């Protein structure tokens, strides 16, 4: 069977790079390859197909390419909104392999996290259990780290952390960071806070509640 | 219009088997090559198999030639794919097509596990009493405890589009959890009225807490 190998695994450009994304088979597939563009909970949108022939409607920048075994997808002056994933698809024979698949991150210059805590819910309250939650949005680069100063003391002990993928216009993310406790616990402690360490200012951004 | 239309998502216990339902529309599958994928949770894209509705011979990856069975019938264009003996390993978005230029299917979520299903109590996200008077302000909705995927938040029921943030909710213990923020001028809040409107499908829930101050 004709495997499909890909790579890069990831990669990273800003915008206006020429970019190419490689796909190669173990065996001849005779230009029968087809590129998708996965953006995240979107269904594959087919690019090129027949090796080199691009879908109507697909922008000029998109170009396919490639001869027996090695093929190469080009996206020329890359734009916001070609992050995501892309896929090769080989049909020269079944079974029609995938490729691994390529992770595309939109170079962008750095943001920082515009930081928002807000203490449990009002009603939540009487369930028995509060989680308080902090929002940092709209930043970059993805790495940046925030912490949980229960009082006094550090805590990491329950917390939900979960990033946005890139903007459509900004590239930038975003991190909805949750401290889950229960009632008592939060009842008894006061300045709750949420402290984001990212790579854009020594000091750290610091939003807190003291109830 | 020329469109496939895939079953809706379904909560099946492992072991089972699901029979998914294509449903192409504007034209006639008799004369196309249909084929699935298959899609695990963060994962990469599997093919399942390839069918010719007008004679029947499908063609499938040893892997899946275990479980999955392609067949369609012209009738009524529905292409169909059965999933025998599910386990967890086949929790995933399965995907129709066609081997044209045409679009493939929204995906039918399969969700194999034995959580009942449950509906998710959404939580109001206002600030905590700080000088929000600064340009824009920013509330939220945090909805947990709900299983299974998926829901859908909205803000003043679509009237909200920009600076509207939903994470994709984490599993714990078999529920989930999600958030959503949103950034309106500090005029809009809170002399105009905010507040999130999150549905649940499998729970024929559907809810509105209002975003009012503390
Ligand atoms: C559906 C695929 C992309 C679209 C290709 C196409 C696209 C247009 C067309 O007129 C014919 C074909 C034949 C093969 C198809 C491919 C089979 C594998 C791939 O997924």
């Not at chain 1, 900004?170 to 806070?193: A, F, G, P, Q, V």
């Not at chain 2, 109590?121 to 206002?126: C, D, G, I, K």
Request: glycine fraction near 6%; hydrophobic fraction near 30%.
């Amino acid at each position: 069977q004709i495997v499909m190998t890909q790579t890069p695994a990831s990669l990273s450009a800003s915008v206006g790079e020429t970019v190419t994304i490689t796909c190669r088979a173990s065996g001849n597939i005779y230009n029968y390859l087809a590129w998708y563009q996965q953006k995240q909970g979107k269904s594959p949108q087919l690019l090129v197909y027949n090796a080199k022939t691009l879908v109507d409607g697909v922008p000029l920048r998109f170009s396919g390419s490639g001869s027996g075994t090695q093929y190469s997808l080009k996206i020329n002056s890359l734009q916001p909104e070609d992050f995501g994933n892309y896929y090769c698809h080989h049909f020269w024979n079944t079974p029609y392999t995938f490729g691994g698949g390529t992770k595309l991150e939109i170079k962008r210059a750095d943001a920082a996290p515009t930081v928002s805590i807000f203490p449990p819910s009002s009603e939540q309250l009487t369930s028995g259990g509060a989680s308080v939650v902090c929002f940092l949005n709209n930043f970059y680069p993805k790495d940046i780290n925030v912490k949980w100063k229960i009082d006094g003391s550090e805590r990491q002990n329950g917390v939900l952390n979960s990033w946005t993928d890139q903007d459509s216009k900004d590239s930038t993310y975003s991190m909805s960071s949750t401290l889950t406790l229960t009632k008592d616990e939060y009842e008894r402690h006061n300045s709750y806070t949420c402290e984001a360490t990212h790579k854009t200012s020594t000091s750290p951004i610091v939003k807190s509640f003291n109830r | 219009e020329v469109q496939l239309q895939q079953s809706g998502a379904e909560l099946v216990k492992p072991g089972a088997s699901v029979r998914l339902s294509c449903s192409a529309s504007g034209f006639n599958i008799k004369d196309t090559y249909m084929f699935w994928v298959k899609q695990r949770p963060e994962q990469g894209l599997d093919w399942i198999g390839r069918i010719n509705p007008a004679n029947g011979i499908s063609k499938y990856d040893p892997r899946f030639q275990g479980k999955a069975t392609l067949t369609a019938d012209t009738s009524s264009n529905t292409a169909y794919l059965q999933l025998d003996n599910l386990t967890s390993e086949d929790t995933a978005v399965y995907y129709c097509a066609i081997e044209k230029d045409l679009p493939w299917g929204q995906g039918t979520l399969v969700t194999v596990s034995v959580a009942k299903t449950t509906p998710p109590s959404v939580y109001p996200l206002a600030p905590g009493s700080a000088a929000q008077t600064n340009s824009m302000v920013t509330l939220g909705c945090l909805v947990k405890g709900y299983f299974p995927e998926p829901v859908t938040v909205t803000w003043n029921s679509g009237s909200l589009s920009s600076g509207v943030h939903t994470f994709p909710a984490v599993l714990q213990s078999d529920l989930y959890t999600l958030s959503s923020s949103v950034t309106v001028p500090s005029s809009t809040w809170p002399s105009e009225t905010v507040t999130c409107n999150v549905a649940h499908p499998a729970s024929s829930t559907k809810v509105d807490k209002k975003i009012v101050p503390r």
